[PDB]
Design a protein around this ligand. Structure first.
Ligand SMILES: *[C@@H]1O[C@H](CO)[C@@H](O)[C@H](O)[C@H]1NC(C)=O
Lengths: 50, 36, 124
């Protein structure tokens, strides 16, 4: 999507593993505000819009 | 005479969907809503 | 909560070898990312080396690519920086930084880092 139309999509009732994001070997700036990335997969939160 | 659909005409602002699988017959249900 | 004490500096002729270390004390398991900084005289402090503690992936700048390597020792909680094939443009102040928010390449001064005391590396 574009920056004039980046939709607030509700993708619900799923899972999302981030260990395959951790070993993707292509990330430049991985910044997780509020909570640490090491405790991101085991504990989650609501309102998981992307 | 096998299909009729005039119950709504509105398709904006959907949030959730769910699709599953379903006198002689007696059917029972209970509908309640506690804390979301 | 993260305290870094670094050492391993000194003077050597160009073409020699040196080895820096940066000992980490405190919340070791919260540290996710080790970055090595370098500030030349008359220049802004830039980034040289990078290390992810979880994955082990290394990132290097273009001026130090093929000559500089970085390694982690989890038993001593100390990151290592080995310098091979040194040139006299590397005379600078070196710093070690520990991150607890994730990994970001390239290194930037304005982000939150736990900063070391700094050491002098002089080559000629
Ligand atoms: C769609 O619903 C959300 C939830 O209240 C609301 O904030 C939004 O304004 C609605 N959009 C339109 C176009 O009415």
């Amino acid at each position: 999507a574009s920056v004039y139309a980046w939709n607030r999509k509700r993708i619900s009732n799923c899972v999302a593993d981030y260990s395959v994001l951790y070993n993707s070997a292509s990330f430049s700036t991985f910044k997780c505000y509020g909570v640490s990335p090491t405790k991101l997969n085991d504990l989650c939160f609501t309102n998981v819009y992307a | 005479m096998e299909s009729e659909f005039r119950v709504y005409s509105s398709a904006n602002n959907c949030t959730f969907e769910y699709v599953s699988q379903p006198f002689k017959n007696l059917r029972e249900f209970v509908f309640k809503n506690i804390d979301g | 909560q993260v305290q870094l004490v670094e050492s391993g500096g000194g003077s050597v002729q160009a073409g020699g070898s040196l080895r820096l270390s940066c000992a980490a004390s405190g919340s070791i398991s919260s540290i996710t990312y080790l970055g090595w900084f370098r500030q030349a005289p008359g220049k802004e402090r830039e980034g040289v080396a990078a290390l992810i503690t979880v994955n082990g992936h290394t990132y290097y700048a273009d001026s130090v690519k093929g000559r500089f390597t970085v390694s982690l020792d989890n038993a001593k909680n100390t990151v290592y920086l080995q310098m091979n094939s040194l040139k006299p443009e590397d005379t600078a102040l070196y710093y070690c930084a520990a991150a607890a928010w994730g990994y970001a390449w390239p290194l930037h001064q304005d982000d939150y880092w736990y900063w070391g005391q700094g050491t002098q590396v002089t080559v000629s």
